[PDB]
Every structure is written in structure tokens, then in C-alpha cells.
Design a protein around this nucleic acid. Structure first.
Lengths: 64, 97, 84, 50
RNA sequence: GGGCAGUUUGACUGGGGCGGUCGCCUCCUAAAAGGUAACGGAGGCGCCCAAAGGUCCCCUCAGGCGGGACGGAAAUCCGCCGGAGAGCGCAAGGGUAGAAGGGGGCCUGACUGCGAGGCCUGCAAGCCGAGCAGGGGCGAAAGCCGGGCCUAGUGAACCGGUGGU
RNA sequence: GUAAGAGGAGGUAUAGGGAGCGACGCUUGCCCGGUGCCGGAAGGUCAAGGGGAGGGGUGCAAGCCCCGAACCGAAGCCCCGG
RNA sequence: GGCGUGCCUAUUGAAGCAUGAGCCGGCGACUCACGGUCGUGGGCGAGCUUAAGCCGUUGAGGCGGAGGCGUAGGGAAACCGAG
RNA sequence: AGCCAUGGGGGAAUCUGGGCGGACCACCGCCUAAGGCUAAGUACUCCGGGUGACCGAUAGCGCACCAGUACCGUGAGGGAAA
RNA sequence: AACCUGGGGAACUGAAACAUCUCAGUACCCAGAGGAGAGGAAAGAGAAAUCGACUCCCUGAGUAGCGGCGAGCGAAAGGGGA
């Protein structure tokens, strides 16, 4: 019966209120030292598109 | 092979402890242009018989609307929805006395 | 069949080429911060609101259009002039 | 390499940060460079930790 | 503690095994955009500089012949000639003396909050940056400054260490 | 055999189990460095345990709960020789 | 007499000296349940609809708003709120 | 890492006794443990009766019929035709 | 015949590998009870001075959490009803 919303996805995604899947910027942890502040604040929020089809199609049930 | 783009990092802050979730008051907002539609009085138990709110614990007036004098009835009230209420209207807080 | 001592090599290494050339020419508008010349050394010196960055690379600086120049005792110039 | 290693700089006057590197091999004792913290203008900055 | 149990024990590849190989940057093959394959040719990177960084004052080489105690093909100085054959960490390629090279003074923009609009590209990541604004260094000013002449010196996520909010 | 117990064996180191060779005649040389194995009441490392100097949350406090050093806690491997 | 390299599977590509089948009959393979999702046929319309159950029927429907969807989003969160 | 349940060890109290409200402490509530019994609402179909946008002798129960029969295997079991 | 409670309790398979997790506390083994089984009056629930045995359905809810944060597994409270 009922599908199953994705745990991981949910707990790491930000699908916007317009059928747009837009998550967070990836590549920040064991980094930082010899790197531009540019890189710091530009590893803030992100975007993404296309496979966000599959993301939405996976969000599901409470949608979210 | 590659993490199915799972390479995307998490940001769901306070996504979960173990004793379930924190029992907090969830509010409920309402566009006061929807308010402009009807006229008379708007209590919690009334507006859920209508079509909004639905057992939303507390009510916060908000949104756009018109300068109509009436008895709004709720808990908290948006500061910018309190400027349409200066034009006309009554403001009741926290209910019981 | 018989196959005695053969061998191998060492050259199986080729650096990935990066897209390198010029992007916007004269006749083409560019509106503030649009790269137009990817170069190694100064194959194309900047100029009239042309701009170079931290790697020899010309980009838009005005909302105008490019054009060229040849100053032998100075180099090769690019000039992005807009309108009055 | 850890010889040049990796350390960070905090302000005096309570905490603050900024990201840097070192070089212990080179005549590098300690450092009191001069940068900017999150709060207010430019100030001290003291060397500490890994 | 194989005595017994359940499982791991890469892939490429002129059949497989041995040998070699996996990623990053340069130069050909590459046929004047891009790009373009091979166990096809040729070499390099996992580091370095708190000054090898940032501004202002300034100088220009490698070499050639001629002339000189040690020196003497080549330590040094001098004369005249000498448009880049020198240098620019490291491989090569691009480039550069109208500076990126080499000397000195003050310093510390390997700055914060942001980022128009472009490179590139399946995704992801990577590359570029005017200006705004805080305040800051130097500069008589004009002004430069989001490290190094540029391309290699790099590792999404999950785990947690440590300081803070 | 989880076990009760079983065979061993109502047999006793000329007896019972395990291994290498395989009558008999000749014979069986050097190496304890790696390892297996025999022993060795000093010792390194290490367990739960035992212990409690010392720290914290909280109550006004009495108290309660957690963190925990010194130092004593085996087998074992290291060590020592055969 | 003019002409004329079997059917299938698989192949870059086959009549195949590649495979499957002597011949005829009958059986024999993209469904369903729930959720999801693009549309599409209607009804309603800032509203829409009920599940379990209860009542009725002997293929007779009907009550039954509990709930789910919708009117608002932004942010990890507090909270702010057409921002 | 609470709470419930407990295999080894220690080892209480009787209404200021006592478990829990998710480390733990204060408080404020909640409930009275370590004795037992309880229908109905729910499940199941060997069984009987009713129904069908269920099959019509290869389909249908394996079996429309003299089927858990023939016969196959020691054997557990297999499983016809009609 | 099947359902029901308790005591034992796998593997394939999934995670495109495989242990941790899955399948599942399922298949089967055993014990026993009965038209039912079992369950059963609160040392409960849960945050409101709020309720009031137990089983059942729906909703809550793929929610809240659990997790080599992967596979995926997945509560009770409240509500409406029996």
C-alpha cells in the first residue's frame, strides 16, 4: 500500500513552495584553511534542478 | 556507485532526539482579506466551522485586508495585521480571564 | 601461439583540456561581468573597460560591445566600448 | 605538511576567528598578526590551538 | 582458538594470468574554435613563501670583445656593444623587462557581510568578477588590495573530535 | 553428548590415546635467527574488578546522581633459557 | 518461359555449415491491491469529500465530518508573517 | 537511555511507605506494584444454508466418475487417466 | 479445517557486495487451551487541576523516531465508532 517518503531526502532537502527542489551547498567540512572567504560564504545555500524530478517524486506523502 | 547525489549535506536542524517531539503551541495564520469576505465576529471555534484554522491551537491575524470594524477573536496578532485593525476592529488576547 | 617477454609503458596520462579561446567578439554586446577571452599568457591585453582577472582572462566591464587592436610595440589589444 | 601545519587565529578581547596556516620550521615562534573580527573594526588577533 | 560457521578475495586488458595501470597539470597525436580515442607518444603534482603577501620610492638582464693582484674557459670590477637568448620555486606550455623580474620603507585585503552578470558542464563540483557596505594597510595624489604571473600541490556525504552561538 | 552419562576400562606407564616412517642389514651430520612446543614465584603492556585524591548538575540546605587520577586487580603476548 | 538465398531468436551484419521447432489440437504469459503521478471525463467550488460504523434493501439506497486535500509562505529552530 | 521485562551478585520499607512523568537533582502531579478470576465487541473455517457481470471434463478441488484409486520408491513421499 | 497463547526459532533475499540491520521474531519444531483463544480494571495514560479495564475497526500515520542516517523498519496519545 502506502509509499514511503524518504527519510534521508527529507532530513537533507529544501523543496520550495513551487515544485522546486533546492538543497544546500555541498563541499564544506575538512576544508577551510587555505581557502577564500569567497569559498566560505559561497558554500552557504545552493540550488539544483533536473533530478529534482526524482526528488519530488520521492518527497511524496506529506509531499514537503 | 557514487552516492545517488546523496553527496548533498543535511541541514534539518533538530531533526530528532528520542522522546518524540517537543509539545509546543502551533499557531495558525489567516489572510484578513478572507476576513473581509465574511462579517460579524471570528472566534476560533467559529472559523473552523467555516473553512480555515482547523483546530490550530492559536490564531494570528495576518495577510492583506480591508478596514472593516468587527470582533476578531484569537490569541496573538501580527504587527502588520494590527495596522489594518487600527483602521477598525477589536483585539482579544490569550482568551480566558 | 607463443608470446615471450612483452611489456608496457608509462604515457597513459593526458591532462584534461579546458575550454580555451575567446568568447565575445566585436559586434557582440556584453553586460557587466561576462567573460570573453580565455588565455594563458597575455594573448589579448585588455583596455577600454575590458577587464582581466587572476589568470589572464578578459571579461565584460561595460554593457557595451567589443573591438580589436594591434599595437606591435605594445601587444594585441581588445577594447569593449559601449555607447554615449 | 605538518611542519607548515594548520593553526587558527583568535582575537584577544574575547574569542573571534579567521582562517590561516603556519610554518614552524621557518623562524616562526608565535604570531600576533593584525586582522578583523566579526564584531567592530580591525584589532589585535592572537595565535592559538591546532 | 580454521577446530567449526557464515562472507569478503576491484577493474581494465588485442583470450586470461604476471608485468603495467586508475586522480590531478603541461606538450604533441589533435587535421588554425571548442573538442577529439588507444597497454599512443613526452614529462611533472601531493609540497613551498609571513614574506616568495600587500602598497609606495627605484633599478634591468644572459651575453660579446677589449683591460686587470689572487681569480683567471667561469669567483670580482671596468670600458664600449648587446630588445630579450636572463630571471620569474618546482614539469612543460603560454607569457612577461611600458614587469609578473630585482633592491628598500610602512604594513598584514591568505578581510567581513554580500554579489550583478559570464566561463564550464549530464549531475555534482570547479573557474571569473565590477560594484555595495564595514573597516583596514600603504600611497603627496590618481589608486591597488577578497594572498602568490597563470595553468598541478586535491577528497560530496554519513562518524565524531575541539572553540563558540 | 546442551546435559545425565557414555566408551576408555571392571584396563593402569611392558597399559591406553596422537603423529612421522614403514621387514631386516648400514645409518641418521650443522641451525633455536621466524614460528610451534617445555619450563622459569623479577619485570613491561592490558580486563572487569578493588579503591578513592579530585570535578560537575541540582536543593536554601540535609542529600541525590554522574565523571574520575594515584595505587593494588589474571590469563595472555612481550622477556628468559631449553 | 521471365523471375526468385525458408520461418524465428540473436546479430554491425545470416539462406545459413549459428539457434528453436516431425506434424496437427487444446493450455500458455504484462494483471491486480494500495499509494503515487501526468492528464482527462464530469459535479461542486474557497471550498471539496467522508473512513470505520449505524439504518434500510434483498442487487434500494441512505444517514454517518472522525479525518485527508485546499485557503501562506519564509527559516534548522524560536519566531516572523505577504513577507 | 528512560520505561517495561530479568539471568548473576548485593539487598529495602508499609501512606513522610512507595513506581513514573526519558541522564540525573528540586518541585508539582500521576498511579498504589511484586496474589488470582471476567462475558461481549475481534479472528478462524472441517461443518450447513444462501449468492454470483465464477469454470464447464486439459478449465475446474489433485479427484464431476468406484480418488487420496491405479501405479512409481525400501522408505518419508509422489501423484494418473478416466 | 483454520484461527489462539506461550517455549524453541533459521536461510534464501534485500541492502544490486557482505557481517551490523533485512526478510522475521516469518517458515517450521514443541507445549496446550477453546468456541473462540488470548487479553483484562490501571504502581495506566499524559500536561490539561485531562481522562478513566480488555480486545476490535477506522483515523491519527508512513506521522514522531529508529538506522554502515543505507536498506528501509516504523510507534503510542488524541478522535470517531464496536
Amino acid at each position: 500500500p502506502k509509499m514511503k517518503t524518504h527519510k534521508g531526502a527529507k532530513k537533507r532537502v529544501k523543496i520550495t513552495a513551487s515544485g522546486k527542489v533546492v538543497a544546500m551547498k555541498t563541499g564544506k567540512r575538512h576544508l577551510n584553511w587555505q581557502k577564500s572567504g569567497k569559498e566560505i560564504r559561497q558554500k552557504g545555500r545552493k540550488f539544483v534542478l533536473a533530478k529534482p524530478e526524482a526528488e519530488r517524486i520521492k518527497l511524496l506523502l506529506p509531499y514537503e | 556507485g557514487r552516492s545517488t547525489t546523496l553527496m548533498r549535506l543535511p541541514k534539518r536542524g533538530m531533526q530528532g532526539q528520542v522522546p518524540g517531539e517537543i509539545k509546543r503551541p502551533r499557531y495558525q495564520g489567516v489572510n484578513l482579506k478572507d476576513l473581509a469576505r465574511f462579517e460579524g465576529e471570528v472566534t476560533p471555534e467559529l472559523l473552523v466551522r467555516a473553512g480555515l484554522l482547523k483546530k490550530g491551537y492559536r490564531l494570528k491575524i495576518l495577510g492583506e485586508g480591508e478596514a472593516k470594524p468587527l470582533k476578531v477573536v484569537a490569541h496573538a496578532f501580527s504587527k502588520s495585521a494590527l495596522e489594518k485593525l487600527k483602521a477598525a476592529g477589536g483585539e482579544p488576547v490569550l482568551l480566558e480571564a | 601461439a607463443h608470446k615471450k617477454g612483452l611489456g608496457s609503458t608509462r604515457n597513459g596520462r593526458d591532462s584534461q583540456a579546458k575550454r580555451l579561446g575567446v568568447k565575445r567578439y566585436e559586434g557582440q554586446v556584453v553586460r557587466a561581468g561576462n567573460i570573453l577571452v580565455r588565455q594563458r599568457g597575455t594573448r589579448f591585453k585588455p583596455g577600454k573597460n575590458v577587464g582581466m582577472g587572476r589568470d589572464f582572462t578578459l571579461f565584460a566591464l561595460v554593457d557595451g560591445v567589443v573591438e580589436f587592436q594591434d599595437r606591435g610595440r605594445l601587444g594585441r589589444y581588445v577594447h569593449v566600448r559601449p555607447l554615449a | 605538511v605538518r611542519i607548515k601545519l594548520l593553526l587558527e587565529c583568535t582575537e584577544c578581547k574575547r574569542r573571534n576567528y579567521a582562517t590561516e596556516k603556519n610554518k614552524r620550521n621557518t623562524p616562526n615562534k608565535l604570531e600576533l598578526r593584525k586582522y578583523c573580527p566579526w564584531c567592530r573594526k580591525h584589532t589585535v588577533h592572537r595565535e592559538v590551538k591546532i
